[PDB]
Each structure stands twice: as structure tokens, then as C-alpha cells.
Amino acid sequence: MNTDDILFSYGEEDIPLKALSFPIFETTNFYFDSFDEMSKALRNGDYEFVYKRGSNPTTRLVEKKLAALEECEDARLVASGMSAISLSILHFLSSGDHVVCVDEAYSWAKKFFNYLSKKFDIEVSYVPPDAERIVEAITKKTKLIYLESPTSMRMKVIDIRKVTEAAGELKIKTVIDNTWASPIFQKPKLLGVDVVVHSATKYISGHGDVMAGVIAGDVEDMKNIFVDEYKNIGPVLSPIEAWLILRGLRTLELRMKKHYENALVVSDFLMDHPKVLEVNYPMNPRSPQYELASSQMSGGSGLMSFRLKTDSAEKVKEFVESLRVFRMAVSWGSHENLVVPRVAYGDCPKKDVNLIRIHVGLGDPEKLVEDLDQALKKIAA
Amino acid sequence: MNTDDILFSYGEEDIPLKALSFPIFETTNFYFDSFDEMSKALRNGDYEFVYKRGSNPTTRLVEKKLAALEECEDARLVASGMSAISLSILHFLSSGDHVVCVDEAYSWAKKFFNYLSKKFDIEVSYVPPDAERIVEAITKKTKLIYLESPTSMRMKVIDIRKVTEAAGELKIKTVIDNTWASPIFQKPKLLGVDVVVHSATKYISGHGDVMAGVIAGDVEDMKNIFVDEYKNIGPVLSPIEAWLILRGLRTLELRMKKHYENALVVSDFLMDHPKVLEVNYPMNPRSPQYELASSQMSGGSGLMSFRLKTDSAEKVKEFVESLRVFRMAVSWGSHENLVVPRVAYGDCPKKDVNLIRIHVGLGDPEKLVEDLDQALKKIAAALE
Amino acid sequence: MNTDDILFSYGEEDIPLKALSFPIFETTNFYFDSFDEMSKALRNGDYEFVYKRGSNPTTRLVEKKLAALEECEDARLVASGMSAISLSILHFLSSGDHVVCVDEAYSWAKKFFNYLSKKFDIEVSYVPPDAERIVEAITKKTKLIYLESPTSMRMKVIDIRKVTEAAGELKIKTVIDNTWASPIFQKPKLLGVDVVVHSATKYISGHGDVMAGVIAGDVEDMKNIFVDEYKNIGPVLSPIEAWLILRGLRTLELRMKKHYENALVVSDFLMDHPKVLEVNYPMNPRSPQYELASSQMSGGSGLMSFRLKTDSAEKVKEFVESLRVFRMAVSWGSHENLVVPRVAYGDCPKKDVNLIRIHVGLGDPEKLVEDLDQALKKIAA
Amino acid sequence: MNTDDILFSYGEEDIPLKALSFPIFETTNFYFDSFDEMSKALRNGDYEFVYKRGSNPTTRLVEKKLAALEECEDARLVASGMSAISLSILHFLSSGDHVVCVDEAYSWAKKFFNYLSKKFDIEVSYVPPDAERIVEAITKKTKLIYLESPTSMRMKVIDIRKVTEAAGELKIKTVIDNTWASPIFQKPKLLGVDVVVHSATKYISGHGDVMAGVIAGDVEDMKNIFVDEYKNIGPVLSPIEAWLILRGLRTLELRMKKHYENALVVSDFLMDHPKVLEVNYPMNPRSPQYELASSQMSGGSGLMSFRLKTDSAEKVKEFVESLRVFRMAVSWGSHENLVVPRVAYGDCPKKDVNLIRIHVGLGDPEKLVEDLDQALKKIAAALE
């Protein structure tokens, strides 16, 4: 299906009372006119409709769109990206199982793996974002391989097909976090991944307000994630926030295109600047990763990082505090132009003392280039 | 603890821009003017403020009010009752542990325990809602006792102090689901429970719209639930819904008192009706459970159940389809007058074919009496 | 109909998709499956549904309830109490017309009358809240009599039936602002008033968040107010706020009863306190107005005023700033316990330098009594 | 004026609690710590903050952004476009005054003028959207000229500078409805208009949900509109909706550029189609109006109209009912692709039986081309 059909019409043929904006079904429950119908609702896995820890008319419309965008059979919205990640992981794991996890996965994904390994008999091997290392860490007990591409902070790309070929051969399940690219620029289901997750907090909502996660994949997986993890743990998204996602989704293609255009300008400037050591933005044609990246992605988002020429946390501090346009904050995926130096985090690797992450928003990239330029001028050569 | 102070003023002395309604902080993030402040935010457990999977100004006000109502040191709002239950359970259990769970706990609580039991090395003993049976099922590996009082569907009360006395002697943690009473009518922290959970979906929001859970307890437990389970699994409540809980809270005492008044009228009617076998409403003074109940609770809510004199599902269907005021729906805790016969559920015990749960709302209880009365007229007398 | 049927079930038999909470129809527009239907929508006065400056499914449910509560045939929700007042006034007036307006009407109602009289050929006589003075001010050109009872600030009651008898005889239209009592405690349509208005900002919403107004009356009046004033001026209420009113309405009877109970306690204390000259709360049995008030009202709300023994704005300031529970703010009608001394206003009459208005909320009235007591002790005898 | 600075940063330097999304101040009121401050609030025109029929922190941020986009000194958000129009009109008119109103103004604007004319001593001259006809209708009692460019339904452009040159010489005030272009593509303040109004219902919100109006202009006018009309008539916008306008504003430039690109494709197709008589889209370079239009506008929106070669309402019905992508609905300004034939309206001029208005949204314009194309195939060729 076309992106535009998905964003602007799919699922919207028949709306209650012929409203054109889908109504917000901010209800816990739904009444029944008959006992028989109520009994069906309380026996079947997914009756439409019975209860908010369950399907919701507003939320389902958005889920239907998101699934179609990821070319998955089904999707579910949940309260956060971490709900999507943690529930997906729980679905695929039991006592005695092993997981291979890329060691540049989002920090809280790794924290969750560590939490399960401390509390239960789950073994985790952390490996670099390198398909060969990933397949080398597979054991006879491996049930899950957890991917992210591009990775967190360092924006490294993995050869996904190489991993999923091996996984598929061995009946090992794969989960990928595709938040960085959005569905506009990468569709990992088509690269053979079983389940795709997003922090919809970032690009899918796009406005730095809603917190939400998406789990997408095949009917069998998603039916079981729904009736087991979702119903038992209950990370329900507010239908008001689902409606806000729908609203945000309308501009997703326009926004992603803008971020890509802007990120090319900013990454080009950073790559050529004498005070920047290196730039991590895999969809710039001059990137060392471009050939692999562009084999898997149709564009890149606004998120990138780069390294200063220093190992001094103090020089990094000088730099970031000198920025007048980029704002110091976490999160990303909106109009906001954001900066975070990795050295701010307690668990920052020593190697990444010099690593700065920026998010390029929806405005005039020359303003961002000038901000970076003036700040770079203020640190010593 | 003063209820009105908590509902109407606690935490509200200083509000951004001197607004009287607390603003809705519907933001993912918060900016920093200083690298040093940002570093503190990204190293410390709970910086105010940095990120939505984190503390939020709107949500934290409501949390502080809820903790104070429960006379607990701290509380967190989460996306549903099941989030409050599941995260609390996970906080207290690891591989090799045992749990005692009352077998009339809310269905999804039991489903979660069974999920854990199937997936990990967690063993669960299910016991009747009887303090003695609960304590008897303790083993040397028991790390959690999971309570609910009154219980789901049957509204059975448990001697909570008898359980917590035993648990505390053995360093076993307790969790209780206090949704039924609300914090107005029961405060199990004062009965020795470690962690109190609610489905704020029900009475605390009170308007059949928001879905939310509450976890409340001591500083140590709550700090760890926050930094471990909440940040890892992320069942974050929308600040918009937090604000709607705040709005609903303002009438919580008024609503709870009205439900209790109404429930007395309805339960009295059912108790005296020839075609009703029995009524499960433990805060009616004629209830067999009243002495124990009234030692732990200062009132009762609108939720009750009763049995018809029958073993026929079809007769229960006849009765429920005859009602014109009560509406067939799940959930409860609002103005809505709701009915669900337990036999509608696939996993209904055989014994509970005749069990009907009703929720008495905020209106004229005589309308509910008349509705029940006209429905009871249309079913046949039981065979003798 | 019973209050409880109105609050809890009227209009809620059939809700889209069987939700029990009425969905929020936050839509500008509605699609049509046929040209014929669209043509009807664009020809008829009130098609269900076509456009948000028009009927809305969410808003209409709340309007239906409000009308039934006021025992009026129809009602409309608008953006503020002043929208309800100003549109009602415009409906009844044209060039060359005269109005009698009670001179203790809400200040902005009087400002609006003054605005019309400056800009257009509208003459206004302001009179005390006294039915005899009101009927004495009627001229052959009088088209409207504007009432409020109890009045603003001074909480005076008018004999409404005496006014409406005379008005009805002369084909003069009446509008009353019934915000003070709420529909729970007074239903002026039953006392013969043509159109009833409320600031739903106050008790009807009840939570100090929504701003909204209600216009209620007969079909003929309301049909014309809708198609003329409402459509031309457009003070549309957000359906999100309508839904919040519906939510608030659920507790309206519980809240009004509580406010009345509390106000009796506080008014009794004020009446007996040696530093209070007089108390304006007409539904206290010891009030000089009680016989008339209780002939028209079934109870009283939380709003009252009282006078200190002083003509010093400074002593009033001392008093109000000494209160630690009552908060200095305008508005009223919620849980909030609020105080405003009339002398704070620029246009405060000299006579009212000593007049304090308080709103008694939903809590323990002894806390309010103790606050007043301690503050009263701190001013000189 | 820098568009991106306005959309993305202006006014957002300091936000309560350092939130990055501005909080929703859904409050009626604000408390005071001091009697003196409360007295200032209740005497002054515009205290920050005191009451919702008043300034609001959320709404004021959006207002300041909108004023800056229009290059006006101040702006106020109100409950609908018609509130912005009606209050602006009332501000400039009193008993005995005359107004010149373009006769292709939005229908409800004309209805309001007629309402005023019927009720009070206000006289109105309706004129074609032609600067010369407008200026010719000026009288010694004219106090207001009411403009809209492009006009409703027919998308006619007016030489605004010719009108404002005349008005300014005679101390006559001008109001213009700039909804069609949005502030991205036309800024009539720079063309000499006194007060600019929008239905933010349409492009400024841009998502077919919020209803809102904007009034923008100089300090003097806006201060008086605020303290007189706005506080007296009270068409207050919900802060929740203000926040949704803020959210919609972030993509305003992206959306407007896309509508323009799409509208060029669709208008080019219609212009070259044998069964279309004419196309009203003044920012297509082949439009007869393009030279005047492009002197005042930097782009065009998605709204256009065109005529079929027919005088038959039934043929227009045939065509519109044949469309499968465009949806029959009023309003415009979002992603929605909408159609309304003017003959659907009861008051449609006879000349406009063949006039069809379409709104081109944010998708693939070729889908719209194909839909129009397949519909045009199914109507008969015009008689010759």
C-alpha cells in the first residue's frame, strides 16, 4: 500500500456518526444488549468492544495504520517504548533461554535484559553491532536476538538480512527497535525480522508530548502478546494519546523528509569542520556505512552524533553549554533541536567521553550550522 | 491524616503561575540550562524533572495525594491496575521463590501469577480467603503473600492483621489489592501490609473513563519499584489522565459515602427477598462477615454480589436479561449501575453458576430495588 | 423527571459502539454519503451532523441533560457565561428598545448593557433587586427585563413570579442568570422566566477548569438563538470541555448538597460573630430574606458575603491577607474555598468597601470557621 | 520576521518547570498571595494571570506566535472564525455607520452584517471583489471596509493595496479574512489592512478538529477588542485547544508548501481538461489573476474551485456522487480531500449552479487527478 493511503485514508471509510476526525473513545467499558454477546466478549481473545485493557476503537484505528506502515499483519500501542520492548522480550523468553543482544541497544533495553538475567534463569550475550559477531554468539539455547539499527548513541548499522537469515534457519526469533528510522525510512519486517518495536514517543507522535510504544509483527505473535503480556501487565495507552498519535501521523512523511534534508546539511557541515573528529550519520553518502545503510533504508532521520577532539569532560561541557539554539534535553523526534553529550550519563563508556548526540528538527538547518560553528570556535584547537 | 486536607489542599500550596487547577504537563522532556544539572538528572534515581518515563509534575501531585490517603510514604501511578499488580509482584519475586495467592484474587492477577509460574521458577499456592489457610501455605521459600479483601466476585473478607503478623515474623512481604473499599474505607498499610495497590480505573477516578493503577508503600520499596520495574517496563500514565484522576479525587469522599448509603439499601432488599439465596456485602450490619469487616473498614462501596436459588445458567440469563436499569458491562466504580453474572465468564467455577455481581451507583437506590424486584418476579420459584 | 435520571441516564440509552462514556467528537466536520443528504444539511437549521459551528454529538448530550435539569425545552452550550448572557440579550433587543436591568447583576452583564447602549439605540434602566422597582421601570418600549437572583456580591433575592406575571401580561421577555443556585436549587423557568442562563464555569462544571455558558428556554427562542446569534457570533464550546462538563455533572447533586450543608455552618458562625456586621446568605433560616428565598429555592449554594465593621480598605486588606485556608481568587463553584473583598475591584461602590465574598467548598466547614475566626480576631474591635 | 523562528522558538525560552511542551493551563482562575496584586488584577486591562475570560499562559504563547507570523503587534485567539469576524466588526461599527463588504465574503460574515443591519442602524453595501467597486461604494459614513482575498467559493483576488490606500486617506478601517492563504502565503498587514482575521479551524490548526478564530492587529485596536468585545461577549478558546493549535502550528510551513505543490498539479489538470469550463486557483501561473495574486501572495493553498460546462444541478450531482476519493463535507485546511458543490447550498446564486469547490490535501495529487478524471468521464459532453 502507499504511505499516503495509510496515513490519510486506511481504516477511515466508516467512522461513527460520519465524523471525519475519529472520535476519542475515552471509556473503560462498553455495555451489552444481550447475555450471549457479553459471554462471547468474556470468552474470546479480542472482542470489539468490552474493556480498555483490551481493544479500543480509537487506539485500534491507529494500530491498523501503524501495522500497515511497517508491513506487519498486526500492531499494538502501549504506554511507552519500554513497554513495547519489555513485553516483546518477555513473549520470546522463558527460564533457561539465551539471548544475543547488541551492546549498543538503547540503555533501558539492556537494563531490562540485565534485570531478567539477575532475577530469572536468562543468559544474555552482549555483542558489537556486527552481524558476524551476532551470529557467532548464537548457542543451542538462544531463543532471541535483539537488534537496533542504527544503534543508540553511535548510530551504527547492522546487516539485518545476514542476521535474520541465520535466525530463520535456526527458528530463533528476532526483535528490532526501528525508532531511529521510523517506518518511513526502514521496514525491517521486509528484512526478515519477526517483531518490530518503536518508541512512538519519538518520530511517530512527533511532537514531544505523547509517550507511547508500538509492537508490530505477524498475527500469531501479536495475538499471544495481546492476550498474555498486554492483558497481564496492562501497559495501556490512553485513547486520548492514541488520537494525538493519529493527529501526529498525518505529517509523518512530511516531517521525516524534512529531517532527512536538514540532517544531510548538518552532517555535511560537521564532517568538514576541523574541530570534529568524526560524524555518525549513516545516511550521509560520505559515511563509511552508507552502502550498507542505503541497502536497508530509504533515508535517514534527524538524529546523529559526532565526536570532539578531546577526552576532557570539561571541554565537552564548555562546548554544549555554548550552544544557544540546540537545547540540552533527552528525547528526540520532534521539531525540537536537542543536544545531549553522552558523558552526562552515569554509565557513559570512557571511549564516549567525546561523543555528542544532536537531534536536527524541522527548521532552517543553517541556523543549526551557525550554532554549531560558533560553539566549535569557542573551544581550543 | 485528614481526608479533606488531602483531597483539597495537600501539595497545592505552590502551583506554576499561581494556577488553581494544576497545569497538565503533557511533555516528554524538560530542558536544562546547565550541563551539571543535566548530569545530575541522568545519574540520580528521580530528578525533578527530566523525562516522562520518570517523574511528571502533574502525576507527582496526584501520587503524593494518593500516598497520603493510604497513609503510605510514597506512591506511583501507572497505566492500569494490572500494571500496579504485576510490577509489585515482580518487585518481590525472583527465581526459586514461592508465593501464597488468595484464590479469589482478581482473575488477571491469578493469570499473571500463572504466567510467571509457567515461564520462570516461581511456585504459587492458591488458597481460600481465610487467614489460617493463607498462613498454613507459607513455606521456607515464600517471599510474597498476595491478598485482596473483600475478594473479587464473592466479596469475602480476610483477617488481614492475622496474615501480616505471621508475614512480618518471617520477613515475608505482603501486597494487597484495596480497589473494592478505596482508601476512604480501608487503609491496609495500617493493618501491616507492605504494598497497597489499586485499580484507579474503578473508584479513585470514579467516572468510567481513565484507566490507571496505583502502587503505594514505604520509601525503600517504592524507590526500587520506580527505578527498576517502572523505568524498565514503562507503564507510564498520561499526565492528561493523571489530571483527570485529580479532578475525580475531589469528589471521592462524597461518592464513597453515597455508594455506601445506596449499597445498604440494595443489600437489605436482597437479603430479605425470598428468591435470593444469599448476599455478599460485608459492610451490611446483618452480614456474617460484619464483625471482621467493620474491624478493618469504616464503610463499604457499591460493589456486591448475590446468588439466585438455582443451578441453571439459563435461569441466570433470564434474570439478567430482565433487568432494565442495571446495564450489562464489566468494570465498576462510577455512577454506572452495572451487572455481570459470573457464568458469563468462560472460567466461571461450577459453584458460581448462580452468582451475580452488581455495582450500585450514585442515584436513587429505590430505582435499583424496583429493577431487581421486577426481575426476580419473572423467574420461577426454585424446586423444593 | 427525577434529577438522578437526568444526571445518570437521560440521553445515554444508545451511545456509539456501545461505549458507556460518551465519546469525544473532537471534529470540525462530518462526511456525507449522498448529495441529497448534504443539501439537507446545508439548508436545514440544525442537521445532525454537519459542522462544529452547529450541533455536536458530545455537546448535544450535555445540552439535553441541562435543558431537562432546568425544565426547559432546549438548551445550548457556549464558550462562557458571558457568551450565554450576551447572546440572550442580543436575541431579545433591537434599535429603539428599552431594558430594565437589576443593578446588582454580574458586572460584565452590566458592562455589556452599557456597551450596547453606547454603540446602539438601546436604553437601559438599572434598578435595585426589588420586584416593585423593576415593574415600575417598565415603559412602553421595554422589551427585556434582566434578572439575577440571588444577585452578584450582595446575594439579594427578587420575587421572580411578581416580575414574570407583569412581564408575561405585557409580552416583555425575561432572562435570568441562575448561576448562584444551580439547577439543583432553583428552576426559574417554573417561576415564569423566558430564558435561563448559567456560567457553567462555576457549579455545573464544578471543578475550576472549564469555562462555559448555558442558554436554556423554549423551542422557539432557542431555535432562533441557535440559527442567528450562535451561528453568526460562533461562541462554540470545545467538545472536550463539553465532555468534561458531563463528567462534572455526575456529582452535581452530591456537590450542591454538600455546599449547602457547609454554607449553613459557615453562615451561622458569621451571623453570630461579634466582628461581623451582617451576612448575606438568603437560604440560612435566620436570614431576613429566607421566606422569599425558600419560596423559590430548595436550597442554597456555597457562595455568600458578609460585612466587616469598617469603612477602611486597609482593615479589609488586613483581614483577607490573614486568611490561611480561603485563597484570594475570583471565580467560584468548585471544591475551592475562595475569598475576594469587593474593594479589590476598581468599580466597587463606596458602600461595599466592607463587603467580603467567600465561597464555601466541599470539605470540613469547621476548618473554614476556624480560619475566619482567627482572622477576625486579628482586626481591632 | 523569520518563519521558522516563530514556529519553533519564539516565546518558548522560559517555560514553567523547564518543560519543552508548554503545559496546558486548563484553569478558570489563579490565586493571589497579596491583596495589592489582586487589586491590580481586578483594575488593570490585562493582568497575567487572573481569569480565563482574560489572558491564559497557554493561549497567550500561541497568540504571540500568531501575531508574529502576521507581522502584527498583537493577536487574540477566540472560539471560532466567526467570533474573530463578528467581534472585529463590532469593534469598528456603531449606530449610524456604513460598511462596504465584498459580496463573495464568507456566507456567515454576510449573514452577520445583515443581522446587524436588521437589528441596528448599520448600513451595508455589498460589492464585487474589485478594488474599484469597493472604493466607489465608500460614503461619508463608511467606517469599515470588509475584505477577503482570495474570496469564498470563487477564489477571486482583490487589489488590497488599492483599497487600503483609499481607506487610509479617509480614516476608514479595514478588516481582511486571510484564512485561504494562511500567514505563510499572505500577510495583509504589510498590504495596509488594519485587522487580520482567520478561521484557525482551517489551515492554522490544520487537522480538522479544533475550532478557533484569530484576530490580529495593532496594539491600540487589539487592546480595545480585548477589554471590550472579548471580555463582554466571552468567545474564549479552551487552553486545551490552544495547545492543539500550538501542536498543529509546528508543521504549518511544511503543510502549506505541500498543499501548494499538490494544488498546482490538480489545478493544471483541471485547466487542461475539455469538460472543465474554468478553474479558480489564483496562484497557478496560468491563472488570469496570477499577476495580481503573486504581487500579494508567496504561494497558494489547497482550496480551489472550478465549473462544469453545464447549467444542470443534476449533472453536478452526477459528477460529485461519482467521486471516490474526495469526500463530501464542508470545512477545509487539513489532510482531508473534500468536495462541496455550491448548488448544495440553499442560497447558491443561480450563476453558481455549475461551481464545485475542492480542497486538495497532503497526499499524492495524482490520486486526486485520477478521481476527478474518472468522474469527468461519466458525465455527458455539453450540448453545442
Coordinates of N, CA and C in Angstrom, one line a residue, chain A residues 25-117:
Chain A
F25 N -12.6 7.6 22.1 CA -13.4 6.7 23.0 C -12.7 6.5 24.3
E26 N -12.8 7.6 25.1 CA -12.2 7.6 26.5 C -13.2 7.0 27.5
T27 N -13.3 5.7 27.3 CA -14.2 4.8 28.1 C -13.5 3.6 28.7
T28 N -13.8 3.2 29.9 CA -13.3 2.0 30.4 C -14.0 0.8 29.8
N29 N -15.3 1.0 29.5 CA -16.1 -0.2 29.3 C -17.2 0.1 28.2
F30 N -17.9 -0.9 27.9 CA -18.9 -0.9 26.8 C -20.1 -1.8 27.3
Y31 N -21.3 -1.4 27.0 CA -22.4 -2.1 27.5 C -22.8 -3.2 26.5
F32 N -23.6 -4.2 27.0 CA -24.1 -5.3 26.1 C -25.6 -5.3 26.2
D33 N -26.2 -5.5 25.0 CA -27.7 -5.7 24.9 C -28.1 -7.1 25.2
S34 N -27.2 -8.1 25.2 CA -27.6 -9.4 25.4 C -26.5 -10.2 26.2
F35 N -27.0 -11.2 27.0 CA -26.1 -12.1 27.8 C -25.2 -12.8 26.8
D36 N -25.7 -13.3 25.7 CA -24.9 -14.1 24.8 C -23.7 -13.3 24.3
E37 N -24.0 -12.1 23.9 CA -22.9 -11.2 23.4 C -21.9 -11.0 24.5
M38 N -22.4 -10.7 25.7 CA -21.5 -10.5 26.8 C -20.6 -11.7 27.1
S39 N -21.2 -12.9 27.0 CA -20.5 -14.1 27.2 C -19.4 -14.3 26.1
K40 N -19.7 -14.0 24.9 CA -18.7 -14.0 23.8 C -17.5 -13.1 24.2
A41 N -17.9 -11.9 24.6 CA -16.8 -10.9 24.9 C -15.9 -11.3 26.0
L42 N -16.4 -12.1 27.0 CA -15.6 -12.6 28.1 C -15.0 -13.9 27.9
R43 N -15.2 -14.5 26.7 CA -14.6 -15.8 26.4 C -13.5 -15.7 25.3
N44 N -13.8 -14.8 24.3 CA -12.9 -14.6 23.1 C -11.7 -13.8 23.5
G45 N -10.7 -13.9 22.8 CA -9.4 -13.2 23.0 C -9.5 -11.7 22.7
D46 N -10.3 -11.3 21.8 CA -10.3 -9.9 21.4 C -11.6 -9.3 20.9
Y47 N -12.6 -9.3 21.8 CA -13.9 -8.8 21.4 C -14.0 -7.3 21.2
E48 N -14.7 -6.8 20.1 CA -14.8 -5.4 19.8 C -16.2 -5.0 20.1
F49 N -16.5 -4.3 21.3 CA -15.6 -3.9 22.3 C -16.1 -4.3 23.7
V50 N -15.2 -4.4 24.7 CA -15.6 -4.8 26.0 C -14.9 -4.0 27.1
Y51 N -13.6 -3.7 26.9 CA -12.8 -3.2 28.1 C -11.5 -2.5 27.6
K52 N -11.1 -1.5 28.3 CA -10.0 -0.7 27.9 C -8.7 -1.4 28.0
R53 N -8.6 -2.4 28.9 CA -7.4 -3.4 28.8 C -7.9 -4.4 27.9
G54 N -7.7 -4.1 26.6 CA -8.4 -4.8 25.5 C -8.3 -3.8 24.3
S55 N -9.1 -4.1 23.2 CA -9.2 -3.2 22.1 C -10.0 -2.0 22.4
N56 N -9.6 -0.9 21.8 CA -10.3 0.4 21.9 C -10.5 0.9 20.5
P57 N -11.7 1.5 20.1 CA -11.9 1.9 18.7 C -10.9 2.9 18.2
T58 N -10.6 3.9 19.1 CA -9.6 4.9 18.7 C -8.2 4.3 18.5
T59 N -7.8 3.6 19.5 CA -6.5 3.0 19.5 C -6.3 2.0 18.3
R60 N -7.4 1.3 18.1 CA -7.3 0.2 17.0 C -7.0 0.9 15.7
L61 N -7.7 2.0 15.4 CA -7.5 2.6 14.1 C -6.0 3.0 13.9
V62 N -5.4 3.5 15.0 CA -4.0 3.9 14.9 C -3.1 2.7 14.7
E63 N -3.4 1.6 15.5 CA -2.7 0.4 15.4 C -2.8 -0.2 13.9
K64 N -4.0 -0.1 13.3 CA -4.1 -0.7 12.0 C -3.2 0.1 11.0
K65 N -3.2 1.4 11.1 CA -2.3 2.2 10.3 C -0.9 1.8 10.5
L66 N -0.4 1.7 11.8 CA 1.0 1.5 12.1 C 1.4 0.1 11.6
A67 N 0.6 -0.9 11.7 CA 0.9 -2.2 11.2 C 1.1 -2.0 9.7
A68 N 0.2 -1.4 9.0 CA 0.3 -1.3 7.5 C 1.6 -0.5 7.2
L69 N 1.9 0.6 7.9 CA 3.1 1.2 7.7 C 4.4 0.4 7.8
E70 N 4.4 -0.6 8.7 CA 5.5 -1.5 8.9 C 5.4 -2.7 8.1
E71 N 4.4 -2.8 7.2 CA 4.0 -4.0 6.5 C 4.0 -5.3 7.4
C72 N 3.5 -5.1 8.6 CA 3.2 -6.2 9.5 C 1.7 -6.5 9.5
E73 N 1.3 -7.7 9.9 CA -0.1 -8.1 9.9 C -0.9 -7.4 11.0
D74 N -0.2 -7.1 12.1 CA -0.9 -6.5 13.3 C 0.0 -5.7 14.1
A75 N -0.5 -4.8 14.9 CA 0.3 -4.0 15.8 C -0.5 -3.7 17.1
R76 N 0.2 -3.4 18.1 CA -0.4 -2.9 19.3 C 0.3 -1.6 19.9
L77 N -0.5 -0.7 20.3 CA 0.0 0.5 21.0 C 0.0 0.2 22.5
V78 N 1.1 0.7 23.2 CA 1.3 0.5 24.6 C 1.9 1.8 25.2
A79 N 2.0 1.9 26.5 CA 2.2 3.1 27.2 C 3.6 3.8 27.0
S80 N 4.6 3.0 26.5 CA 5.9 3.6 26.2 C 6.6 2.7 25.3
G81 N 7.7 3.2 24.7 CA 8.7 2.4 24.0 C 9.2 1.2 24.9
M82 N 9.5 1.5 26.2 CA 10.0 0.4 27.0 C 8.9 -0.6 27.3
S83 N 7.6 -0.3 27.3 CA 6.6 -1.3 27.3 C 6.7 -2.2 26.1
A84 N 6.8 -1.6 24.9 CA 6.8 -2.4 23.7 C 8.1 -3.3 23.7
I85 N 9.2 -2.8 24.1 CA 10.5 -3.6 24.2 C 10.3 -4.7 25.2
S86 N 9.9 -4.4 26.5 CA 9.9 -5.3 27.5 C 8.9 -6.5 27.3
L87 N 7.7 -6.1 26.8 CA 6.7 -7.1 26.6 C 7.1 -8.0 25.4
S88 N 7.7 -7.5 24.4 CA 8.2 -8.3 23.2 C 9.3 -9.3 23.7
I89 N 10.2 -8.8 24.5 CA 11.2 -9.6 25.1 C 10.6 -10.8 26.0
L90 N 9.7 -10.5 26.9 CA 9.1 -11.4 27.7 C 8.4 -12.5 26.9
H91 N 7.7 -12.1 25.8 CA 7.0 -13.0 24.9 C 7.9 -14.1 24.4
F92 N 9.1 -13.8 24.1 CA 10.0 -14.7 23.4 C 10.9 -15.5 24.4
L93 N 10.8 -15.3 25.7 CA 11.8 -15.8 26.6 C 11.1 -16.6 27.7
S94 N 11.8 -17.7 28.2 CA 11.5 -18.4 29.3 C 12.8 -18.9 30.1
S95 N 12.6 -19.4 31.3 CA 13.7 -19.9 32.1 C 14.6 -20.9 31.2
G96 N 15.9 -20.7 31.3 CA 16.9 -21.5 30.6 C 17.3 -21.0 29.3
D97 N 16.6 -19.9 28.8 CA 16.8 -19.4 27.5 C 18.0 -18.4 27.5
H98 N 18.6 -18.3 26.3 CA 19.7 -17.4 26.0 C 19.3 -16.4 25.0
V99 N 19.9 -15.2 25.1 CA 19.6 -14.1 24.1 C 20.9 -13.5 23.7
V100 N 21.0 -13.1 22.4 CA 22.0 -12.3 21.9 C 21.5 -10.9 21.8
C101 N 22.2 -9.9 22.4 CA 21.7 -8.5 22.4 C 22.8 -7.6 21.9
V102 N 22.5 -6.7 21.0 CA 23.5 -5.8 20.5 C 23.9 -4.8 21.7
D103 N 25.1 -4.6 21.9 CA 25.6 -3.9 23.1 C 25.4 -2.4 23.0
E104 N 25.0 -1.9 21.8 CA 24.6 -0.5 21.6 C 23.1 -0.3 21.5
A105 N 22.3 -1.3 21.9 CA 20.9 -1.2 22.1 C 20.7 -0.1 23.1
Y106 N 19.5 0.5 23.0 CA 19.0 1.6 24.0 C 19.3 1.1 25.4
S107 N 19.8 2.0 26.3 CA 20.3 1.7 27.6 C 19.2 0.9 28.4
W108 N 18.0 1.4 28.4 CA 17.0 0.7 29.2 C 16.6 -0.7 28.7
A109 N 16.8 -0.9 27.4 CA 16.6 -2.3 26.8 C 17.6 -3.2 27.5
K110 N 18.9 -2.8 27.5 CA 20.0 -3.5 28.2 C 19.7 -3.7 29.7
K111 N 19.2 -2.6 30.3 CA 18.8 -2.7 31.8 C 17.8 -3.7 32.0
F112 N 16.8 -3.8 31.1 CA 15.8 -4.8 31.2 C 16.3 -6.2 31.0
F113 N 17.2 -6.4 30.0 CA 17.9 -7.7 29.9 C 18.6 -8.1 31.2
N114 N 19.4 -7.1 31.7 CA 20.2 -7.3 32.9 C 19.2 -7.7 34.1
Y115 N 18.1 -7.0 34.2 CA 17.1 -7.3 35.3 C 16.6 -8.7 35.2
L116 N 16.2 -9.2 33.9 CA 15.7 -10.5 33.8 C 16.8 -11.5 34.1
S117 N 18.1 -11.2 33.7 CA 19.2 -12.2 34.0 C 19.5 -12.2 35.5

